[PDB]
Amino acid sequence: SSGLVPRGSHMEIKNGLCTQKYTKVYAEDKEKWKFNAPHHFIVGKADCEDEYIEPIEYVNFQEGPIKEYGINGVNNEDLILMVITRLQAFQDSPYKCRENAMAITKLQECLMWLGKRTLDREVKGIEGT
Amino acid sequence: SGLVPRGSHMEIKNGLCTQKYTKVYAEDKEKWKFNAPHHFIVGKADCEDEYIEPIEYVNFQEGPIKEYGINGVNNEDLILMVITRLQAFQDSPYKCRENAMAITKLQECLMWLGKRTLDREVKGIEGTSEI
Amino acid sequence: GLVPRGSHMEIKNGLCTQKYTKVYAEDKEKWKFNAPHHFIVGKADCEDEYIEPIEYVNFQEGPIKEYGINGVNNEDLILMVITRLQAFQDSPYKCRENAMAITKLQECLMWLGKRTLDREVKGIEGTSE
Amino acid sequence: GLVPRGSHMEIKNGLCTQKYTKVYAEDKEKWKFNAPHHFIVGKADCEDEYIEPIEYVNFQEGPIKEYGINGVNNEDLILMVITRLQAFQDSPYKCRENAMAITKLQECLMWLGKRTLDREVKGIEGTSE
Amino acid sequence: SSGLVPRGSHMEIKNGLCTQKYTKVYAEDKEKWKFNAPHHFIVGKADCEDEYIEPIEYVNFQEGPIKEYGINGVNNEDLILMVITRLQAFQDSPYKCRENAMAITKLQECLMWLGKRTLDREVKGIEGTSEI
Amino acid sequence: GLVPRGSHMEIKNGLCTQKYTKVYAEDKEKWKFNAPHHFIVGKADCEDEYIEPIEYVNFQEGPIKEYGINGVNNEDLILMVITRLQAFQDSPYKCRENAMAITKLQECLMWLGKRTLDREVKGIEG
Ligand SMILES: [Zn+2]
């Protein structure tokens, strides 16, 4: 109940575009990455000691084909969808600002490009292999 | 059971998003606090509309941190997860131009939100409820 | 050979080099469904009173449901151009400018298709609603 | 009302709905100067064996000053799509997707023109490099 | 001493996207802006007292329409060209990176949008004039 | 008020019309650390044999503690142009072309800054 776990082999996702002023993002060890990608992220509090993670939230992504492991996580599109929704809500508030508008546009165009990968794999017939 | 009562939860629907296996839900718009939804659920789509089959719960920071403390994730955290995974894909056999475009979009989204944050730092109002 | 200009207007764009060819559409008073639909690419060195057609391009006027398939869509023309520029990128003449142009054109299709997908949440696609 | 499809190839693009029309081009073995120049928009409701032409679009093939003006340019079609989208914006059909698309198509024209202006700075306009 | 000049009527151009680590940007006061924009910019050392400016560089922009007032300063396009040229040089070097590539693309598209404006104004015969 | 062009290179760019002004840098042979640092804006109506200086612009050349702060940064000039274009946007000359330009310049600043921030996470910048 210390709201606190051993950092273990979890890797801290540290990226120049993120300030880590309040939160830190961890994922699992690269050695445990399945299918070329990380799938088990933790958002913890940044002022936590480095040997531990103070967990705020866990986010797990679909890992393996739904065909044999079933539905077991979220998709990138789900998270992007939540952000667009929230930002759009702020646009409908006194916090409306141009930076949010650009961010919404970028996120929509992001969804468009990911969708294009999918639609192309349709026209090629190999969807979800 | 795997199902929970849908209740006031509203399904979030975008045409840009497919919906085959997953569904996204937020708390009811009348129940939003601080002008946005903060309590999302991804559930299984093949569920009756009366219910939600929750896969994942995501709760966002409610209220400025400097006034209410850390109690949820930020947009930036989720976007960083998606970036990290797309970059991982690019460093794989499935590197592709669409993923590169999507990374560029997500990074530029982070830069626009970060311009907002920097401006609010300069004005000293970052993490508050000032406008 | 030539035809009379008449009520046809010349479509000038400052972004368009307009060296050897000129573009025309029907008079703006003659537009149906709020847009021009009958375009003529003609030769530039021709009379003011004359258009020397090279090609006619006819867009779908009104809903197919009522007026039948009777013209092309914007998406079709843009598909043509994307195909050609992608062909150039398989050539000695691959250049970054063509790559940018392809990216812009694909993103244009994406925004038009977001409009379509939204109208297909409402089942009003191809209609005048 | 029909022509045989023959060697014409069907342009399938995932960003293109192909709900009511298909776009066809000439065989790749017949592409001249690295690119297709002879496109057909036909009705999607036809057997593969046949094409039901709605419209013919022919692109200038060969240098203009050696073969004369025999077809349209990419910029011509893009100009028409921009013109019609701006008409839509100046109508009840105005929407943000159209504004986005108009922006993208203008930036397309800007990049293609850059290619031109650069080649003129190098003094190499209209040559094989 | 010999370097320092009084800040006086100079405004400091603070932008959250600029780091201000080694330099600061100043311009003439908004009250003195001619033709709706600042034209007299000073890059100075940041590690100065706010009372003074330590000029590193003066940049003076074309002030008043050229047709009317003649050439007396640089244009936005000139400085953007300078920056593009340097960034392209960095791309053609051991220090090639994707961020510079994006910045070059953005600056080029900036030149293209300003140029669409200039094109459109040529066609109207109003380029270089004060006409709207 | 002219000067000899000398070894100075003229920056000839398809995106630049040279209608009123020409931009010049130093000879490629004199480039330090892979880039030009000493630019001149001169009047374009000048024979190739002279430069008609309107303005000199010198960029930070060499490491800062070895040679001092001896010039401007790319970010500074972009900040000037953004400030001017925003002023124009608050004027009778407001237009969509300016707004697009501003957006591009802000995104340019974001990308250059990202390189800086990435380097700082990895422990070296400046
Ligand atoms: Zn863009």
PDB file of C-alpha atoms in Angstrom, chain D residues 2-129:
ATOM      1  CA  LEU D   2     -18.673  -0.776 -73.607  1.00  0.00           C
ATOM      2  CA  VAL D   3     -15.080  -1.352 -74.683  1.00  0.00           C
ATOM      3  CA  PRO D   4     -13.012  -4.467 -73.872  1.00  0.00           C
ATOM      4  CA  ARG D   5     -10.705  -4.033 -70.907  1.00  0.00           C
ATOM      5  CA  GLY D   6      -7.881  -5.834 -72.678  1.00  0.00           C
ATOM      6  CA  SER D   7      -4.458  -4.844 -71.400  1.00  0.00           C
ATOM      7  CA  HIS D   8      -5.727  -1.866 -69.377  1.00  0.00           C
ATOM      8  CA  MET D   9      -4.704  -2.078 -65.735  1.00  0.00           C
ATOM      9  CA  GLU D  10      -6.989  -1.163 -62.847  1.00  0.00           C
ATOM     10  CA  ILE D  11      -5.630   1.429 -60.410  1.00  0.00           C
ATOM     11  CA  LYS D  12      -6.559   0.175 -56.928  1.00  0.00           C
ATOM     12  CA  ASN D  13      -5.746   2.665 -54.175  1.00  0.00           C
ATOM     13  CA  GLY D  14      -6.745   2.043 -50.567  1.00  0.00           C
ATOM     14  CA  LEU D  15      -7.518   5.750 -50.142  1.00  0.00           C
ATOM     15  CA  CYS D  16      -9.918   5.463 -53.102  1.00  0.00           C
ATOM     16  CA  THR D  17     -13.375   4.080 -52.447  1.00  0.00           C
ATOM     17  CA  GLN D  18     -14.028   2.623 -55.933  1.00  0.00           C
ATOM     18  CA  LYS D  19     -17.713   2.449 -54.861  1.00  0.00           C
ATOM     19  CA  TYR D  20     -19.152   3.821 -58.102  1.00  0.00           C
ATOM     20  CA  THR D  21     -16.223   4.224 -60.521  1.00  0.00           C
ATOM     21  CA  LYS D  22     -12.931   2.541 -61.327  1.00  0.00           C
ATOM     22  CA  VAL D  23      -9.832   4.154 -62.806  1.00  0.00           C
ATOM     23  CA  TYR D  24      -7.962   2.351 -65.485  1.00  0.00           C
ATOM     24  CA  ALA D  25      -4.735   2.986 -67.229  1.00  0.00           C
ATOM     25  CA  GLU D  26      -2.720   1.501 -69.923  1.00  0.00           C
ATOM     26  CA  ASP D  27      -0.522  -1.461 -69.530  1.00  0.00           C
ATOM     27  CA  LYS D  28       2.714  -0.855 -67.790  1.00  0.00           C
ATOM     28  CA  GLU D  29       4.494  -2.416 -70.708  1.00  0.00           C
ATOM     29  CA  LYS D  30       3.157   0.415 -72.709  1.00  0.00           C
ATOM     30  CA  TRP D  31       4.059   3.203 -70.408  1.00  0.00           C
ATOM     31  CA  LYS D  32       5.894   5.854 -72.230  1.00  0.00           C
ATOM     32  CA  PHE D  33       8.455   8.087 -70.578  1.00  0.00           C
ATOM     33  CA  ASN D  34       8.230   6.250 -67.224  1.00  0.00           C
ATOM     34  CA  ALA D  35       4.539   7.001 -66.576  1.00  0.00           C
ATOM     35  CA  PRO D  36       0.975   6.278 -67.691  1.00  0.00           C
ATOM     36  CA  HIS D  37      -0.632   8.987 -69.840  1.00  0.00           C
ATOM     37  CA  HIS D  38      -3.973   7.449 -70.918  1.00  0.00           C
ATOM     38  CA  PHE D  39      -6.508   6.977 -68.125  1.00  0.00           C
ATOM     39  CA  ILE D  40     -10.170   5.996 -68.205  1.00  0.00           C
ATOM     40  CA  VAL D  41     -12.805   6.442 -65.535  1.00  0.00           C
ATOM     41  CA  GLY D  42     -15.328   3.660 -66.040  1.00  0.00           C
ATOM     42  CA  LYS D  43     -18.348   2.468 -64.105  1.00  0.00           C
ATOM     43  CA  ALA D  44     -17.447   0.039 -61.356  1.00  0.00           C
ATOM     44  CA  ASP D  45     -20.420  -1.990 -62.383  1.00  0.00           C
ATOM     45  CA  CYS D  46     -18.898  -3.923 -65.220  1.00  0.00           C
ATOM     46  CA  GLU D  47     -17.268  -7.283 -65.687  1.00  0.00           C
ATOM     47  CA  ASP D  48     -13.531  -7.394 -65.457  1.00  0.00           C
ATOM     48  CA  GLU D  49     -13.624  -8.304 -69.123  1.00  0.00           C
ATOM     49  CA  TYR D  50     -15.061  -4.953 -70.042  1.00  0.00           C
ATOM     50  CA  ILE D  51     -14.721  -1.324 -69.135  1.00  0.00           C
ATOM     51  CA  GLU D  52     -17.690   1.072 -69.274  1.00  0.00           C
ATOM     52  CA  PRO D  53     -15.979   4.420 -69.984  1.00  0.00           C
ATOM     53  CA  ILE D  54     -17.422   7.466 -68.276  1.00  0.00           C
ATOM     54  CA  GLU D  55     -14.477   9.662 -69.147  1.00  0.00           C
ATOM     55  CA  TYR D  56     -11.083   9.688 -70.857  1.00  0.00           C
ATOM     56  CA  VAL D  57      -8.142  11.640 -69.419  1.00  0.00           C
ATOM     57  CA  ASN D  58      -4.963  11.858 -71.473  1.00  0.00           C
ATOM     58  CA  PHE D  59      -1.728  13.326 -70.167  1.00  0.00           C
ATOM     59  CA  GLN D  60       0.874  15.107 -72.260  1.00  0.00           C
ATOM     60  CA  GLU D  61       3.442  12.496 -73.266  1.00  0.00           C
ATOM     61  CA  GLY D  62       6.794  13.523 -74.665  1.00  0.00           C
ATOM     62  CA  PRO D  63       8.389  16.964 -74.456  1.00  0.00           C
ATOM     63  CA  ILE D  64       5.972  19.679 -75.518  1.00  0.00           C
ATOM     64  CA  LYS D  65       8.349  21.268 -78.024  1.00  0.00           C
ATOM     65  CA  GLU D  66       9.066  17.967 -79.825  1.00  0.00           C
ATOM     66  CA  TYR D  67       5.543  16.470 -79.898  1.00  0.00           C
ATOM     67  CA  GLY D  68       3.252  19.477 -79.432  1.00  0.00           C
ATOM     68  CA  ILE D  69       0.507  19.776 -76.845  1.00  0.00           C
ATOM     69  CA  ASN D  70      -1.189  16.356 -76.756  1.00  0.00           C
ATOM     70  CA  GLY D  71      -2.591  16.147 -73.221  1.00  0.00           C
ATOM     71  CA  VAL D  72      -3.159  17.716 -69.820  1.00  0.00           C
ATOM     72  CA  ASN D  73      -0.728  18.252 -66.952  1.00  0.00           C
ATOM     73  CA  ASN D  74      -1.060  17.055 -63.370  1.00  0.00           C
ATOM     74  CA  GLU D  75      -1.462  20.725 -62.407  1.00  0.00           C
ATOM     75  CA  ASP D  76      -4.531  21.028 -64.668  1.00  0.00           C
ATOM     76  CA  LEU D  77      -6.485  18.320 -62.836  1.00  0.00           C
ATOM     77  CA  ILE D  78      -5.315  19.563 -59.436  1.00  0.00           C
ATOM     78  CA  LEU D  79      -6.523  23.031 -60.413  1.00  0.00           C
ATOM     79  CA  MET D  80      -9.970  21.718 -61.257  1.00  0.00           C
ATOM     80  CA  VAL D  81     -10.252  19.883 -57.951  1.00  0.00           C
ATOM     81  CA  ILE D  82      -9.185  22.994 -56.049  1.00  0.00           C
ATOM     82  CA  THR D  83     -11.688  25.117 -57.978  1.00  0.00           C
ATOM     83  CA  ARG D  84     -14.581  22.767 -57.238  1.00  0.00           C
ATOM     84  CA  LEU D  85     -13.621  22.396 -53.578  1.00  0.00           C
ATOM     85  CA  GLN D  86     -13.573  26.182 -53.232  1.00  0.00           C
ATOM     86  CA  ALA D  87     -17.013  26.285 -54.833  1.00  0.00           C
ATOM     87  CA  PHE D  88     -18.158  23.796 -52.181  1.00  0.00           C
ATOM     88  CA  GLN D  89     -16.649  25.987 -49.465  1.00  0.00           C
ATOM     89  CA  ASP D  90     -18.699  28.891 -50.850  1.00  0.00           C
ATOM     90  CA  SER D  91     -21.899  26.836 -50.540  1.00  0.00           C
ATOM     91  CA  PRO D  92     -24.011  25.121 -47.849  1.00  0.00           C
ATOM     92  CA  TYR D  93     -21.593  22.192 -48.171  1.00  0.00           C
ATOM     93  CA  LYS D  94     -18.661  24.044 -46.541  1.00  0.00           C
ATOM     94  CA  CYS D  95     -16.718  21.850 -44.112  1.00  0.00           C
ATOM     95  CA  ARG D  96     -13.300  21.641 -42.508  1.00  0.00           C
ATOM     96  CA  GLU D  97     -12.325  18.529 -44.477  1.00  0.00           C
ATOM     97  CA  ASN D  98     -12.615  20.568 -47.672  1.00  0.00           C
ATOM     98  CA  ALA D  99     -10.526  23.425 -46.245  1.00  0.00           C
ATOM     99  CA  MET D 100      -7.872  20.895 -45.236  1.00  0.00           C
ATOM    100  CA  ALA D 101      -7.947  19.272 -48.694  1.00  0.00           C
ATOM    101  CA  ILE D 102      -7.717  22.626 -50.488  1.00  0.00           C
ATOM    102  CA  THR D 103      -4.689  23.447 -48.354  1.00  0.00           C
ATOM    103  CA  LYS D 104      -3.071  20.100 -49.181  1.00  0.00           C
ATOM    104  CA  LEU D 105      -3.677  20.525 -52.931  1.00  0.00           C
ATOM    105  CA  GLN D 106      -2.222  24.020 -52.865  1.00  0.00           C
ATOM    106  CA  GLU D 107       0.886  22.710 -51.123  1.00  0.00           C
ATOM    107  CA  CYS D 108       1.034  20.019 -53.823  1.00  0.00           C
ATOM    108  CA  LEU D 109       1.069  22.717 -56.496  1.00  0.00           C
ATOM    109  CA  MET D 110       3.722  24.572 -54.504  1.00  0.00           C
ATOM    110  CA  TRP D 111       6.043  21.555 -54.367  1.00  0.00           C
ATOM    111  CA  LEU D 112       5.650  20.698 -58.066  1.00  0.00           C
ATOM    112  CA  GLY D 113       6.322  24.322 -58.951  1.00  0.00           C
ATOM    113  CA  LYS D 114       9.404  24.304 -56.732  1.00  0.00           C
ATOM    114  CA  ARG D 115      10.744  21.469 -58.825  1.00  0.00           C
ATOM    115  CA  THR D 116      10.213  23.622 -61.907  1.00  0.00           C
ATOM    116  CA  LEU D 117      11.763  26.810 -60.457  1.00  0.00           C
ATOM    117  CA  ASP D 118      14.776  24.871 -59.190  1.00  0.00           C
ATOM    118  CA  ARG D 119      15.393  23.318 -62.586  1.00  0.00           C
ATOM    119  CA  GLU D 120      15.234  26.798 -64.109  1.00  0.00           C
ATOM    120  CA  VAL D 121      17.799  28.158 -61.628  1.00  0.00           C
ATOM    121  CA  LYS D 122      19.995  25.291 -62.845  1.00  0.00           C
ATOM    122  CA  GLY D 123      19.086  26.321 -66.415  1.00  0.00           C
ATOM    123  CA  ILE D 124      18.072  22.759 -67.305  1.00  0.00           C
ATOM    124  CA  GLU D 125      14.357  23.250 -68.057  1.00  0.00           C
ATOM    125  CA  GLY D 126      12.779  20.655 -70.339  1.00  0.00           C
ATOM    126  CA  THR D 127      15.696  18.263 -70.885  1.00  0.00           C
ATOM    127  CA  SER D 128      16.401  14.630 -69.986  1.00  0.00           C
ATOM    128  CA  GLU D 129      18.093  15.849 -66.738  1.00  0.00           C
TER     129      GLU D 129
END
